[PDB]
């Protein structure tokens, strides 16, 4: 499983900071997901940070906005480096003995969260990439041309990839776009009954839903309810979408309505719940509704935070590594199941 270091290039760390990586030249975080944040602020690596003055966090600028809003990483402020998407970056890693290497980094949108990144490496030891948590529709890598060297893909010696959906049961995922319009409308007809019906979207408490928020927002001309949108306050472009009010007809509040409104004027709110949910179909399947009825006020609909298998597939077709290595076993899967479903799509 993927521990925070690439065989290719040891001293840097992406997405762990504790165990091994307290040794860490520099840090790499792809994006605000708790399970990519491990030890990110444990003491023992403040106390690393105090005894090596030269360790930076690298990150896309939106994740040092993101990272920097909560109080208990506040701390990194003197030493998180922003890099500028698709902008290739010099970085040097510097030995606290002399030795001194130097990387070149690229920032490649994954499709996850806001600030979600994959890290694409080249040093002396040949080309990685990271792909942190992705979700790429078909074409989406072909078109990245810093994934490109004269019309060809670059020559990449290891992938280390998102493999959430890594099993062929998961072969097709409806689109980001198909995923928006199912629930766009489900809450357009059920909103525009009367100002007393009310949706309540059932969201982990995540980063990425918030392009589903944006557009409802954007196109029903209403304010989605959160429990706290302080670290969207430099974000027009969400923040706007977003209040703390309860008064609206679309609710994103967490633990009826959790925040607790049940009437207005003392008519009782006729609430849906819509609970976004990962939904697939099968190689030999057809596409059915994005929206699945579970009860007469309950809802789940169509939503990914990461590739299907064909994309999963495609992805690493395009990119014909070397080595391909699965960030994730999925619960009912094996490693030795995911790199052997993978190991065809790889040069050795
Ligand atoms: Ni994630
Ligand atoms: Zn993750
Ligand atoms: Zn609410």
Not at 169 to 178: A, G, L
Not at 283 to 296: A, D, L, M, P
Request: aromatic letters at 10%; proline letters at 5%.
């Amino acid at each position: 499983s993927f521990e925070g270091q690439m065989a290719e290039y040891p001293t840097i760390s992406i997405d762990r900071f504790d165990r091994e990586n307290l040794r860490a030249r520099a840090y790499f975080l792809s994006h605000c997901h708790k399970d990519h944040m491990k030890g990110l602020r444990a003491p023992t690596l403040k106390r690393r940070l105090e005894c090596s003055l030269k360790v930076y966090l690298y990150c896309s600028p939106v994740t040092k906005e993101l990272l920097l809003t909560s109080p208990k990483y506040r701390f990194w402020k003197k030493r998180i480096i922003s890099i500028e998407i698709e902008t290739p970056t010099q970085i040097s890693l510097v030995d606290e003995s002399g030795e001194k290497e130097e990387i070149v980094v690229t920032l490649l949108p994954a499709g996850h969260c806001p600030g979600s990144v994959m890290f694409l490496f080249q040093g002396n030891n040949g080309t990685v990439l990271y792909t942190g948590d992705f979700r790429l529709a078909q074409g989406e890598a072909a078109r990245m041309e810093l994934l490109h060297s004269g019309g060809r893909v670059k020559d990449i010696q290891s992938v280390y990839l998102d493999t959430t959906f890594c099993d062929p049961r998961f072969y097709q995922i409806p689109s980001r776009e198909e995923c928006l319009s199912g629930v766009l409308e489900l809450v357009r007809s059920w909103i525009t009954r009367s100002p007393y019906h009310v949706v309540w979207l059932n969201c982990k408490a995540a980063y990425g839903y918030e392009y589903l928020f944006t557009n409802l927002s954007e196109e029903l001309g209403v304010q989605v309810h959160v429990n706290k949108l302080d670290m969207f306050r430099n974000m027009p472009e969400i923040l706007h979408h977003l209040t703390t009010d309860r008064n609206t007809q679309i609710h994103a509040c967490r633990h009826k309505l959790p925040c607790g409104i049940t009437s207005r004027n003392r008519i009782p709110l006729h609430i849906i719940s819509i609970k976004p949910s990962t939904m697939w179909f099968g190689e030999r399947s057809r596409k059915t509704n994005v929206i699945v009825r579970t009860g007469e006020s309950s809802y789940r609909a169509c939503f990914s935070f990461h590739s299907s298998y064909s994309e999963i597939k495609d992805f690493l077709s395009y990119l014909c590594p070397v080595n391909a290595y699965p960030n994730v076993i999925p619960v009912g899967t094996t490693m030795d199941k995911v790199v052997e479903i993978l190991k065809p799509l790889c040069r050795s």
